Write a protein that holds these residues in place. Structure first.
Motif, PDB file in Angstrom:
ATOM      1  N   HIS A  10     -56.679   5.825 -23.980  1.00  0.00           N
ATOM      2  CA  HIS A  10     -55.854   4.736 -23.484  1.00  0.00           C
ATOM      3  C   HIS A  10     -54.536   4.664 -24.245  1.00  0.00           C
ATOM      4  CE1 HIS A  10     -58.996   2.112 -21.191  1.00  0.00           C
ATOM      5  NE2 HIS A  10     -58.969   3.368 -20.782  1.00  0.00           N
ATOM      6  N   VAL A  47     -51.620   6.421 -22.480  1.00  0.00           N
ATOM      7  CA  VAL A  47     -50.941   5.912 -21.296  1.00  0.00           C
ATOM      8  C   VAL A  47     -49.453   5.669 -21.543  1.00  0.00           C
ATOM      9  CG1 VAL A  47     -50.765   4.009 -19.684  1.00  0.00           C
ATOM     10  CG2 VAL A  47     -52.998   4.929 -20.312  1.00  0.00           C
ATOM     11  N   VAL A  48     -48.631   6.152 -20.609  1.00  0.00           N
ATOM     12  CA  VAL A  48     -47.173   6.023 -20.688  1.00  0.00           C
ATOM     13  C   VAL A  48     -46.628   5.160 -19.560  1.00  0.00           C
ATOM     14  CG1 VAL A  48     -45.181   7.380 -21.343  1.00  0.00           C
ATOM     15  CG2 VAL A  48     -47.414   8.475 -21.088  1.00  0.00           C
ATOM     16  N   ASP A  49     -45.380   4.719 -19.699  1.00  0.00           N
ATOM     17  CA  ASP A  49     -44.747   3.879 -18.679  1.00  0.00           C
ATOM     18  C   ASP A  49     -43.461   4.465 -18.099  1.00  0.00           C
ATOM     19  OD1 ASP A  49     -45.310   1.078 -20.939  1.00  0.00           O
ATOM     20  OD2 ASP A  49     -45.161   3.227 -21.400  1.00  0.00           O
ATOM     21  N   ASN A  79     -51.678   9.859 -16.914  1.00  0.00           N
ATOM     22  CA  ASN A  79     -51.987   8.442 -17.015  1.00  0.00           C
ATOM     23  C   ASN A  79     -53.330   8.145 -16.341  1.00  0.00           C
ATOM     24  OD1 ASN A  79     -49.717   7.696 -18.430  1.00  0.00           O
ATOM     25  ND2 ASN A  79     -48.891   6.333 -16.836  1.00  0.00           N
ATOM     26  N   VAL A 113     -52.532   0.741 -12.278  1.00  0.00           N
ATOM     27  CA  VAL A 113     -51.881   1.706 -13.150  1.00  0.00           C
ATOM     28  C   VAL A 113     -52.201   3.109 -12.661  1.00  0.00           C
ATOM     29  CG1 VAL A 113     -51.768   2.665 -15.465  1.00  0.00           C
ATOM     30  CG2 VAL A 113     -51.925   0.189 -15.171  1.00  0.00           C
ATOM     31  N   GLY A 139     -45.622  -3.292 -17.489  1.00  0.00           N
ATOM     32  CA  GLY A 139     -45.711  -1.890 -17.858  1.00  0.00           C
ATOM     33  C   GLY A 139     -47.144  -1.409 -17.828  1.00  0.00           C
ATOM     34  N   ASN A 140     -47.322  -0.098 -17.697  1.00  0.00           N
ATOM     35  CA  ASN A 140     -48.658   0.489 -17.639  1.00  0.00           C
ATOM     36  C   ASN A 140     -49.490   0.219 -18.878  1.00  0.00           C
ATOM     37  OD1 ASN A 140     -48.398   1.816 -15.084  1.00  0.00           O
ATOM     38  ND2 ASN A 140     -47.097   3.330 -16.095  1.00  0.00           N
ATOM     39  N   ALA A 141     -48.942   0.569 -20.036  1.00  0.00           N
ATOM     40  CA  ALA A 141     -49.644   0.369 -21.294  1.00  0.00           C
ATOM     41  C   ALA A 141     -50.189  -1.057 -21.402  1.00  0.00           C
ATOM     42  CB  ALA A 141     -48.715   0.672 -22.462  1.00  0.00           C
ATOM     43  N   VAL A 187     -53.175  -1.567 -18.890  1.00  0.00           N
ATOM     44  CA  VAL A 187     -54.360  -0.866 -19.335  1.00  0.00           C
ATOM     45  C   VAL A 187     -54.987  -1.539 -20.553  1.00  0.00           C
ATOM     46  CG1 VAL A 187     -55.297   1.327 -20.136  1.00  0.00           C
ATOM     47  CG2 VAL A 187     -53.499   1.303 -18.421  1.00  0.00           C
ATOM     48  N   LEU A 188     -54.202  -1.783 -21.596  1.00  0.00           N
ATOM     49  CA  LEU A 188     -54.746  -2.412 -22.797  1.00  0.00           C
ATOM     50  C   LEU A 188     -55.274  -3.820 -22.552  1.00  0.00           C
ATOM     51  CD1 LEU A 188     -52.246  -1.164 -25.528  1.00  0.00           C
ATOM     52  CD2 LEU A 188     -54.574  -0.361 -25.048  1.00  0.00           C
ATOM     53  N   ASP A 234     -58.434  -3.866 -21.017  1.00  0.00           N
ATOM     54  CA  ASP A 234     -59.499  -3.525 -21.953  1.00  0.00           C
ATOM     55  C   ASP A 234     -59.903  -4.779 -22.726  1.00  0.00           C
ATOM     56  OD1 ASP A 234     -59.398  -0.855 -21.222  1.00  0.00           O
ATOM     57  OD2 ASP A 234     -58.248  -0.233 -22.991  1.00  0.00           O
TER      58      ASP A 234
END
Ligand code: FPS
Lengths: 302, 306
Positions: free
Chosen positions: A83, A86-88, A93, B86, B104-106, B109-110, B113
């Motif tokens: 995890h 993961v990039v934006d 991804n 994502v 944003g994706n990060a 995702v986080l 979680d």
């Protein structure tokens, strides 16, 4: 006791770990099977799972459910790393996220197959703390004004806490004494912290300067900025704000050496390793313990 | 049972569930709470948590722990969405940017979680080893399923939606009844109901994708039931178009000829019929439970679904 004595001592249990890891990652999907083979054939130290098996054996655990904890601990770690990939706006991804989830969720199933609420309480809390730490770290990117209280919490949450839970849960599983339990719980916490501080300074010594290039404020960096010349303190804050400053590694290094940021961190890590070695004094002196002490030393050796 | 008759009978608990959800976004890390608030206040639907609540009631549960199991379930569901947006690279989730497009994706995702682990903490607080055993397996089933469809018939599709949607419905109702102390029969009852409802629910969602984010399944040429039917019974032209569109994982700009093919074969009404089949099973399975307004509602929701 050196890594070799520590390896032979754990050879058999680490086979149990590997076997439990393969059994959980045995499904039709190259991507997954190949990751299992990847993990068990990794020539790395794999310290997190070693600590889990060592902790249990040090308190006389005779069975072998401790090998399932070592395994889920490694999963938590693997899953968090995927995890972290993961990039934006800057595997993939998609794979990083889904395989990550597969591993996390599988980690939770293993936790409960142990059938112990206490273990579940602790692990359940640690992983949520770990996740929390990952977001705090995300907010700290490009932020040169974070306090050490904050940072100290970042490393504890994202690295220490998992070491703590691995040692502690292995103790719980072996139904050890509340006193012994706290010995392992602290040893993991302190060793985990020492482990991260060492990791942070080695980033300045993959390619040194990654934390810098990403604008991630780590202790070595937060120290030089505060304990440095205004000329430097500005370059550092600028490097943290704009990111992409790998090219400033030398100037930053020379700012660190000037106030001994790196040395001050290494020394700080050693206090940690010495605190973990101390916490272990409440345990029966045995090769298993000698091994847990041996790891604390290695963790901070140059 | 009528919707409003349900929204009222269930009103008070769902109010609790809503609170039970929002009190969990209490992290010292602001970003978690913000993003949480962002995604959980988009209306949603809350059918997963409503089922849970009603299932506990339809077995005599007079407590307030069903509100807690209903909340974590929403969290689990919430998490899958974040992670999914994502992965599907979605920038839109009902009139508004997805959480990743905004944070944003990060962050998605986080934070996702965070939410899932929190839901997990929330299950252990209930201290029920069985719930944990059924729920964890459910989530792992959903996950292995997503990794799967990341690497061409009806049977294949009925498997793809079991993991994706039906399974969590199954867990929702079953773990809710178990937490109450239902009988081995009631448990098995609630379980099938959730599984079928979830199956029906998805069938309706897929047909609602061809209008009534509309039309996005076709854009990525995915084999939902409606599309497969139009392929098999349409003309060899409409059949070749659809198949190549799926093999291509892209049917963008083909909506008109596709709908034509569907309306001709009656592909949608057929999907709807199939949905009704699952809804019947769901209702026919709640038989084991005692006749109570709750059960009347769980049946109502089954009818509303289709
Ligand atoms: C949080 C965790 C541990 C695991 C979660 C595992 C995940 C991400 C599951 C995804 C399940 C869903 C809702 C898929 C829909 S893809 P779609 O395009 O067919 O549906 P859509 O329209 O995007 O909702």
């Amino acid at each position: 006791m050196n890594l070799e004595k520590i390896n032979e001592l754990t050879a058999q249990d680490m086979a149990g770990v590997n076997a439990a890891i393969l059994e959980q990652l045995n499904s039709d999907v190259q991507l997954i099977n190949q990751l299992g083979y990847y993990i068990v054939s990794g020539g790395g130290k794999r310290i997190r799972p070693m600590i889990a098996v060592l902790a249990a054996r040090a308190v006389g655990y005779e069975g072998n459910a401790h090998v399932t904890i070592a395994a889920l601990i490694e999963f938590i770690h693997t899953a968090t790393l995927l995890h972290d990939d993961v990039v934006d706006e800057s595997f993939g991804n998609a794979a990083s996220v889904l395989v990550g989830d597969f591993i996390y969720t599988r980690a939770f199933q293993m936790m409960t197959s142990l059938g112990s609420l206490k273990v579940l309480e602790v692990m359940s809390e640690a992983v949520n703390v770990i996740a929390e730490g990952e977001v705090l770290q995300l907010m700290n990117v490009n932020d040169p004004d974070i306090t050490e209280e904050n940072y100290m919490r970042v490393i504890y949450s994202k690295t220490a806490r998992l070491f703590e839970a691995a040692a502690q849960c292995s103790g719980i599983l072996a139904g050890c004494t509340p006193e012994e339990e706290k010995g392992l719980q602290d040893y993991g916490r302190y060793l985990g912290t020492a482990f991260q501080l060492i990791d942070d300074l080695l980033d300045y010594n993959k390619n040194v300067g990654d934390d810098l290039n990403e604008g991630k404020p780590t202790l070595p960096l937060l120290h030089a900025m505060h304990h440095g010349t205004p000329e430097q303190a500005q370059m550092i804050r600028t490097a943290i704000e704009q990111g992409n400053g790998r090219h400033l590694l030398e100037p930053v290094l020379e700012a660190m050496n000037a106030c001994g940021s790196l040395e001050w961190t290494r020394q700080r890590a050693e206090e940690e390793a010495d605190k973990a070695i101390a916490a272990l004094q409440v345990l029966p002196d045995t090769p298993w313990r000698e091994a847990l002490i041996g790891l604390a030393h290695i963790a901070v050796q140059r």
